Subunit: 255 residues, 4 copies
Amino acid sequence: ANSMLKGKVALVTGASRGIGRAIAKRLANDGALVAIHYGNRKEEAEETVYEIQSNGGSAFSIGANLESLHGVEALYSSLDNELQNRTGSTKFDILINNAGIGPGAFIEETTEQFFDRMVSVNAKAPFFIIQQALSRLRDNSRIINISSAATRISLPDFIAYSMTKGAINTMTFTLAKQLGARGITVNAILPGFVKTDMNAELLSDPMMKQYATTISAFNRLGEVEDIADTAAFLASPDSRWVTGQLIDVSGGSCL
Amino acid sequence: ANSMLKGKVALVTGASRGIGRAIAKRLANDGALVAIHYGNRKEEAEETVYEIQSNGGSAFSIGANLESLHGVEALYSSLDNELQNRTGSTKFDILINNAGIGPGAFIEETTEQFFDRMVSVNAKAPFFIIQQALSRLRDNSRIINISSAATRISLPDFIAYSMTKGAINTMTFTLAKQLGARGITVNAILPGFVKTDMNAELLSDPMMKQYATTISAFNRLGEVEDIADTAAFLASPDSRWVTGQLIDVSGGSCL
Amino acid sequence: ANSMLKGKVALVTGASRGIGRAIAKRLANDGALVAIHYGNRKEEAEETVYEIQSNGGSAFSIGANLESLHGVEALYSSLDNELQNRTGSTKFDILINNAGIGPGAFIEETTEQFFDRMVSVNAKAPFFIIQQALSRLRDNSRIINISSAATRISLPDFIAYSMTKGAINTMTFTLAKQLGARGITVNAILPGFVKTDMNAELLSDPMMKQYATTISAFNRLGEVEDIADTAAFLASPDSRWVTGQLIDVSGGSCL
Amino acid sequence: ANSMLKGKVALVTGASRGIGRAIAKRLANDGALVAIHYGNRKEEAEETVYEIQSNGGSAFSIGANLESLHGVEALYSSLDNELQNRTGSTKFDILINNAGIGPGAFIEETTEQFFDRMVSVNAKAPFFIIQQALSRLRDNSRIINISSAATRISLPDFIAYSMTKGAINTMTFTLAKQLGARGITVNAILPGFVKTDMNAELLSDPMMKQYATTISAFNRLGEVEDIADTAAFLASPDSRWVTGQLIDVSGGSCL
Ligand SMILES: NC(=O)c1ccc[n+]([C@@H]2O[C@H](COP(=O)([O-])OP(=O)(O)OC[C@H]3O[C@@H](n4cnc5c(N)ncnc54)[C@H](OP(=O)(O)O)[C@@H]3O)[C@@H](O)[C@H]2O)c1
Ligand SMILES: NC(=O)c1ccc[n+]([C@@H]2O[C@H](COP(=O)([O-])OP(=O)(O)OC[C@H]3O[C@@H](n4cnc5c(N)ncnc54)[C@H](OP(=O)(O)O)[C@@H]3O)[C@@H](O)[C@H]2O)c1
Ligand SMILES: NC(=O)c1ccc[n+]([C@@H]2O[C@H](COP(=O)([O-])OP(=O)(O)OC[C@H]3O[C@@H](n4cnc5c(N)ncnc54)[C@H](OP(=O)(O)O)[C@@H]3O)[C@@H](O)[C@H]2O)c1
Ligand SMILES: NC(=O)c1ccc[n+]([C@@H]2O[C@H](COP(=O)([O-])OP(=O)(O)OC[C@H]3O[C@@H](n4cnc5c(N)ncnc54)[C@H](OP(=O)(O)O)[C@@H]3O)[C@@H](O)[C@H]2O)c1
Ligand SMILES: [Cl-]
Ligand SMILES: [Cl-]
Ligand SMILES: [Cl-]
Ligand SMILES: [Cl-]
Ligand SMILES: [Cl-]
Ligand SMILES: [Cl-]
Ligand SMILES: [Cl-]
Ligand SMILES: [Cl-]
């Protein structure tokens, strides 16, 4: 545990498991008060909180289903209540847009319903979460969006997913120019394959694993800690001169 | 006289005016049969048809409202009927996804309805237009998506628009890998500022004019023919070894 | 044969064989007077000329060893003499920087001598060829540099070669901004593997072939015509709004 | 207090002043033993050493003229001697290729000597510095190449300089694939305008100042610490999953 982020308040969406959980634990380890958002798995969120507290950090869990904007509004209603109680204001410093879905389909298999849901959760929700954060973020804050190396490496069997993450990349680079006036940086992290349960079944196939492992310059799968450790830098004061950037965190996958 | 596209059949979406109309004229000049799609009133499209025919070319118009997928269905029902009678086949060769909208709003001004409409028209429609095209495209066909230089140059005042075009960019590179098995290429053209009747209000302010003029390395506004002339290469057999590419056609804007 | 480039004069470096020969034949086919430069293989250059003339075009061969700037100076002394005789001036319209070398070495195997030679031929010579072309090129001319997809796809066994082509890419994008004032476009073509004798021995190994073939979205090796057909567009008036761009002509290799 | 680099050994080239000196101070602050290389007179480097030591850190200086490969040889002969006595080993952990020059010239002003010197100092030297480093670098080491935003933003008035930095960019991405087998990462930092005593003449013109200031999304000139603070992340164990990347550290210049 250290004090790099002492005095700072972070919201991490989708922090009940996987990458978001790792990110949340790393930020709390560095001294931040962390809001652990969950979509519906409350007890997993509570576990993330428990782990943070066990290691001397401060965190709390709040739910919101982000599949509609009424969910975004709910996120901020709860965040406001908890932060007001704990800190005397509804202000915060670090926003991690991590929550997302990623089911596969080729273009010929993609239905309207599937497409619309991918957009609602992965592109629309982060945009509206940022929109509502603007009144709450302090100057010199940090916005980090979790994208995907699928925006750099062609995966036609995930085409709708890739498109939503392409929208996130353009959103990042575009907003960075406006929000730099307030000192707020906006960056994206593009993970490669990372052992989590968005891909537990996909990676269960040994062919798929071999492909996933060997594409990295380091000949291993990524771990949640690999992503969290880069997010910690982007969340910190040290990264003040890096904005609008799409940082690959794939272990040099497909160089 | 160019006969590069003799025997070819092309569909250009949103081709009543502006860039779409110019692409339609150019493709027809090169020998293609051109379906000129329009979203509302036929009169503009019918006048383009008359102009093409007066210059010795072949074209017809088809109306469909692409604000919903029902319009995509109607587009293809009409196209199938027209092509079967005109050519003995429902198959075609060249798909130009030009149809789109581009109103402005900063993130803080962007409503849910505004955002959903941008996605529906600019990302969802081209996606399902391609989906339905695949059973009709011949091998060695060409798909050209009209994107925007706004995906390379930050325009916060058009943020939802930019996001939609970034989604198109990712779709373009992703699908190219899949469709190469059929010799089909998929590319995007990224225009900068182009003079139309439609853009001529944003372009009325002489300050904005000066910015848009001198951003180009050639120090002039783009013209619809500048775009159409690059689309002609991408639609031709000569571009066979170029796929998945985002081709800037901005007169070297902001290099 | 056509007249797209009627009245235009082109110089193609390294046109005695391979890609440069293909480019030269395509430009002459479109009506250009083509200067066929060769390093030392005069009879192969004469064959390129013979082939062009057989198909109704106009061309001539001139030698210059580009391994030193005295070679560049010699190139232009001969070009000036021949063009003055044939046209009444030393002006021209299209410059193709194609000539180059590409032997392999990992970083640990690269000597100072090897490195220096790669730079002299592949980076320095094209820069100085362009420098000397500036007094000779008309307004609205075209500069096309042949680079390599090795600038996008990591090939550590060709590291010095890749670095020289990276320098070419930056040179292209940078000069485009200055030369746009005269209407002159500057672009690069990045080929993938193409069956020529820069890689005849490398591809003779069936393992290397399989890799070279299957990385393309089209599951074939590139042909010299694939490169020439893209160069014809970049050389033409149709490409006036495309400048500073690095155009992949690899058949969607490694998307 | 940061102890991120405790036990680590770093070499920073051209670290008498400017960015190199700032990186050296920061790395030493984080616990690294720092070799501070200088190209001419020792006094600047020795003063940095004194400053680091006064703040509790460990460092020493080594002189070598990197305008030739003989200087690279001399660098490593001195470094081997120093490290063996200081640490019991010739091995080290962190290589920062910062040494370079950056005089301006348009293409039409660029002499052969000017061009050759730029290559020798900016591309050839870092290449052979890495070559000689590989036998000395431990597994899980870090190589960080200081490049330039001029590879993303066209500066025709620095064209040879830009070309040299594009060569460094390509080398960075290419080598990352090779070196991942040893857990070694290779990345580049691309600064924008940074305030030094060295840049302060180009920056004296208030017109140029205004351009360089407002090009950033943060509307201020870069500072040496802005660069050093990102280098600290790339030098650390936390950046293990980031390799082959060109990280813009320009305060979001020209987004
Ligand atoms: N793992 C990879 O290989 C990989 C690669 C590239 C990018 N990524 C990206 O990394 C991020 C996290 O991925 P992950 O692998 O850690 O995912 P994961 O293990 O599936 O966890 C997803 C998280 O998102 C939340 N979430 C999902 N749908 C939601 C909804 N509709 N409303 C609110 N919250 C919702 C979940 O909350 P509940 O627990 O309540 O369901 C959960 O905390 C995503 O943006 C993903 O695209 C992952
Ligand atoms: N103009 C520029 O500077 C610029 C720059 C970058 C990108 N672009 C892109 O280029 C494309 C067109 O450029 P433009 O400026 O020439 O277009 P435009 O002049 O604005 O005309 C738009 C065309 O798209 C059709 N359209 C719009 N919404 C539609 C809908 N909902 N359903 C069906 N059709 C619809 C219209 O058909 P109707 O005639 O029936 O309305 C019209 O012909 C767009 O994708 C645009 O984003 C333009
Ligand atoms: N083929 C590929 O797979 C591939 C892939 C990517 C990029 N490229 C690029 O495409 C371009 C042409 O390649 P290629 O495969 O066609 O090469 P090639 O078959 O080896 O032909 C090279 C040409 O360059 C000329 N040349 C070589 N060294 C020279 C020198 N020192 N001075 C003057 N001229 C010299 C040669 O003239 P002489 O005949 O007199 O020797 C010859 O005409 C090069 O820039 C290359 O890097 C090729
Ligand atoms: N400053 C900027 O705005 C900017 C922007 C983009 C990139 N960069 C890059 O960042 C690096 C340094 O930036 P800077 O402006 O802080 O540097 P600087 O202030 O110009 O100082 C240059 C340093 O490099 C060393 N050096 C120069 N030529 C050398 C040679 N031939 N042999 C050995 N050492 C040599 C010098 O050592 P001595 O003290 O012994 O001379 C000096 O410490 C360069 O690679 C530069 O291109 C800077
Ligand atoms: Cl987990
Ligand atoms: Cl707590
Ligand atoms: Cl118009
Ligand atoms: Cl009609
Ligand atoms: Cl040949
Ligand atoms: Cl002749
Ligand atoms: Cl300084
Ligand atoms: Cl010392």
